[PDB]
């Protein structure tokens, strides 16, 4: 079993991760990296069948699936400045990544 857990807003289920975007060769794909320092590939939702934008360093979630294609996992979500906020005060955020918004800012950079 397991003890109530949370679940307002959309957060990374047990299955799910979060991984940030690298670079996409155009096809249904694109190549993420995890907290713990592991490039890889996604494919897109059979659902999001559309031209969705998508950009280098954009922190999506992720979910693995089973013994098939040579991909590991599929895009869940797209993650916005606000969300990954959330998730960070949630305490979920990854900190291999949490070393990214803190630099991260908005506007001409003061330093």
Known sequence: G????????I??????????VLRTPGNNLHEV???QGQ?????????????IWIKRGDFLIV???EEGEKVKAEISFV?????VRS??????W???????????NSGPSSG
Do not use: W
């Open 63 to 65: 979910d693995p699936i």
């Open 11 to 20: 957060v990374p289920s047990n299955q799910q991760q979060i991984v940030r």
């Open 94 to 104: 990854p900190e291999a990544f949490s070393e990214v918004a803190e630099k991260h």
């Open 79 to 83: 993650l916005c400045k606000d969300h």
């Open 33 to 35: 990296e995890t907290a």
């Open 87 to 92: 998730l960070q005060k949630e305490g979920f």
């Open 39 to 51: 490039r890889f590939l996604v494919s897109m939702p059979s659902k999001y069948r559309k031209n």
């Open 2 to 9: 397991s003890s109530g857990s949370s679940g307002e807003h």
